[PDB]
């Protein structure tokens, strides 16, 4: 059924699965009209589709042109996510197609499920987890490729950089979520942490700095302090 903290290790078994998050698919800048009214201006967005086992990110870029002349954009965006997600699967070789797809927001369930009627053996599933994938746009390299796009485009990343060489997927996902949670709770401080030291650098083919193992431990602690932090500042504890 749904996905929560009990069946939490299922992500890292050997059934191919993908997470789909639609939070950044439709993005705007609410501004004033000459008449003192309020209007939207759309800016580029992305579908965040992730294999939690391998770290492969299928980042589909959603160009503002897709919205031109359409109505009820919030609802369209969910159908547009589902269409792109189904196209991605269809382009994949059978042996690479996922056996499940877990959506981070329950409103994608029906759009995806309709788009995937042709794939009866693929389970479309919700989750109870509060995953911080929305903060995928606080990752400079990701935000950069999205805002620069002049057309629809799909770009591939490993969101784990090289981590799997040294750690298991379970731990890598936990590092990932910890990092995105911090970006979601206080983006500025989360980023000051990541780049306070100029000797550490982000490899050209990577999204995160190349931290030694001991440096990842110092980073991971500072991120928990922050998340525990902003939880006080916010809850006065």
């Amino acid at each position: 059924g749904a996905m929560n903290s009990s069946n939490y290790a299922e992500l890292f078994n050997n059934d191919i699965k993908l997470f789909v998050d639609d939070t950044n698919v439709y993005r705007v800048t609410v501004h004033k009209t000459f008449e003192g009214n309020v209007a939207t201006k759309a800016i580029n967005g992305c579908i965040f589709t992730l294999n939690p086992k391998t770290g492969h990110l299928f980042l589909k870029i959603i160009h503002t042109s897709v919205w031109a002349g359409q109505k009820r954009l919030s609802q369209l965006a969910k159908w547009k996510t589902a269409e792109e997600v189904s196209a991605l699967v269809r382009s994949l070789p059978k042996e690479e197609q996922p056996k499940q797809i877990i959506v981070t927001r329950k409103a994608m369930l029906d759009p995806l499920e309709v788009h995937m009627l042709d794939f009866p053996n693929i389970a479309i599933r919700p989750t109870e987890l509060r995953l911080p994938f929305s903060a995928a746009m606080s990752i400079d390299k990701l935000s950069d490729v999205v805002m620069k796009a002049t057309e629809p485009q799909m770009v591939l990343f490993n969101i784990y950089d090289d981590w799997l060489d040294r750690i298991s997927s379970y731990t890598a996902f936990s590092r990932l979520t910890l990092l995105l949670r911090a970006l979601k709770t206080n983006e500025e401080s989360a980023k000051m942490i990541l780049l306070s030291d100029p000797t550490i650098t982000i490899k050209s083919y990577h999204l995160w700095p190349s931290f030694t193992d001991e440096q990842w431990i110092t980073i991971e602690s500072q991120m928990r302090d922050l998340i525990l932090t902003e939880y006080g500042r916010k809850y006065n504890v």
Partner: protein, 300 residues
């Protein structure tokens, strides 16, 4: 005016005939029902005093044969039967009428409730939904399952209603995924009306049979069917004006005839708030919306 005579009434039973019903006592002298208005299908149904488990019944059209009811003490129910001997049947009925052992089908003459509930129902279509071709009449009971219910287990005893499924391929055109799923006009009009039912009357006929079966017998599949046939209309943006009006009347009489104490189970909350307040046809069911608010504001 036709007659359904009974051999005898050996067990205490509540008897039903279209929307009416009366209590018959163990071996009370009772030999049937007279004065049944020719021209409509009819249903005659049963709820034993002893085993309120299993309501059952028989759909029948008096224009299609001479039918009588006889208790079968082995299988434990009142069974409908046909007499082929046309002249043997007259003499039996006449004898029972002369001894005044029948109840009169009690039609008040201002009342078209039955007509209004059975408008589009036709014995010929009942017999395809309920398959038992050696019999002109059709047995139904509470426990019978539908063809769609068995795909989710005896095929002979099933209700073969028209399968409707909104998250299906029949229902959703390649490349119109969103259009067809938020606006079911394609499925209603092209798939179902033109392709399968042929006309709106056949559709309304299955719709009305579905509700009666649910009302009289408590058949869950029947109810799922009726709700499904309603939702598909109400979720279609392009429906002929004459169907919307017809549907507002049909529903009106169904909701009027429902037992009030039965409404918490027979009516699906989600489907009705959606049809009445959020669907394309939220403004097209004036009489159905009216009665639902005067009489069942609670569900809403």
């Amino acid at each position: 005016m036709n007659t359904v005579p009974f051999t005898s009434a050996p067990i205490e039973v509540t008897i039903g005939i279209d929307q009416y019903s009366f209590n018959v006592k163990e071996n009370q002298p009772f030999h049937g029902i007279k004065d049944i208005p020719i021209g409509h299908v009819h249903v005659i149904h049963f709820q034993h005093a002893d085993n309120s488990s299993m309501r059952y019944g028989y759909w029948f059209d008096c224009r299609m044969g001479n039918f009588y009811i006889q208790y079968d003490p082995k299988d434990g129910l009142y069974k409908m039967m046909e007499e082929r001997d046309g002249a043997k049947f007259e003499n039996i009925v006449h004898n029972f009428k002369e001894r005044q052992m029948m109840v009169s089908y009690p039609k008040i003459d201002e009342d078209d409730t039955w007509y209004n509930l059975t408008e589009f129902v036709q014995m010929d279509k009942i017999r395809k939904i309920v398959r038992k071709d050696e019999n002109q009449f059709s047995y139904v009971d509470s426990s019978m399952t539908t063809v769609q219910e068995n795909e989710l287990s005896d095929p002979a005893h099933s209700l073969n209603y028209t399968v409707i499924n909104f998250k299906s391929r029949e229902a959703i055109r390649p490349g119109h995924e969103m259009e067809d799923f938020l606006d079911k006009s394609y499925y209603l009009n092209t798939v179902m009306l033109q392709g399968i039912f042929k006309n709106s009357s056949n559709y309304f006929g299955e719709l009305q049979f579905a509700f009666l079966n649910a009302m009289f017998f408590g058949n869950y599949g029947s109810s799922l069917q009726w709700h499904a046939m309603i939702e598909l209309i109400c979720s279609s943006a392009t429906v002929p004006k004459h169907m919307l009006d017809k549907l507002d009347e049909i529903l009106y009489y169904q909701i009027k005839t429902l037992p009030e104490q039965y409404s918490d189970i027979l009516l699906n909350e989600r489907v009705w708030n959606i049809c009445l307040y959020s669907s394309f046809q939220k403004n097209s069911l004036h009489n159905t919306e009216k009665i639902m608010e005067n009489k069942y504001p609670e569900l809403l």
